Amino acid sequence: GMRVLIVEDEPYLAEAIRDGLRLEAIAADIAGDGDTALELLSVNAYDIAVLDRDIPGPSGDEIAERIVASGSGMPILMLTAADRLDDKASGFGLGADDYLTKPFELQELALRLRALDRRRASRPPVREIAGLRLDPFRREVYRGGRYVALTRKQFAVLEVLVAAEGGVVSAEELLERAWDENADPFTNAVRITVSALRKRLGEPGIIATVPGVGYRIDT
Numbered sequence: 001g002m003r004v005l006i007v008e009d010e011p012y013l014a015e016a017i018r019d020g021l022r023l024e025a026i027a028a029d030i031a032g033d034g035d036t037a038l039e040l041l042s043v044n045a046y047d048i049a050v051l052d053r054d055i056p057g058p059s060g061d062e063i064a065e066r067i068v069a070s071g072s073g074m075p076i077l078m079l080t081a082a083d084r085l086d087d088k089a090s091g092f093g094l095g096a097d098d099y100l101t102k103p104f105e106l107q108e109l110a111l112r113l114r115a116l117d118r119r120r121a122s123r124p125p126v127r128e129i130a131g132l133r134l135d136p137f138r139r140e141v142y143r144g145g146r147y148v149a150l151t152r153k154q155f156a157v158l159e160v161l162v163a164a165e166g167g168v169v170s171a172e173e174l175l176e177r178a179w180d181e182n183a184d185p186f187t188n189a190v191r192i193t194v195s196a197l198r199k200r201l202g203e204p205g206i207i208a209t210v211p212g213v214g215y216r217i218d219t
């Protein structure tokens, strides 16, 4: 079977999709808003995300962006009233794998879900090591079971270090992966963020400097 997430803020439509797919071995969870969608993604694995664009809270576009950035490789189908060519351009630009406009035919949605699921490949990024557990959908961190509040940028840097599994990551790579490609900050922004991150995580030290190279999670 298949498990899919339906993010759609018109409730009778979302329920009709879930209901219409169920006996064809596609089990769907429904989120009526962006915050609920992130809550579901933080705890459940899905085969496909079906995303409305205009929803309360964080938009379907922001959900898509977080899915792509999480490196799960979960395919994204946008299902939306935004039907202009400009809308398709921005949707595919955000990382959608398919784009279906309303009004739509349920059996076409089903055919496209099956086609997406067939061509999904793999290795999800490591998000847990050395007593740290990271959740990229809520941007939350627990260290030995204790919630640690971090800023967005602190979390982005910690994510890269944890994904590296104890391996070394240079300041230049942290720059590339945690600041936008069209940004060009200097390495001092990275070193300053690492210092703040260390202070948030507390003792004992868990991020090690490797002189002249970069930083690693101390395993």
Ligand code: BEF
Pocket: 052, 053, 054, 055, 079, 080, 081, 082, 102
């Ligand atoms: F509100 Be969805 F973009 F149709």
Ligand SMILES: [Mg+2]
Pocket: 008, 009, 010, 052, 053, 054, 055
């Ligand atoms: Mg909507």
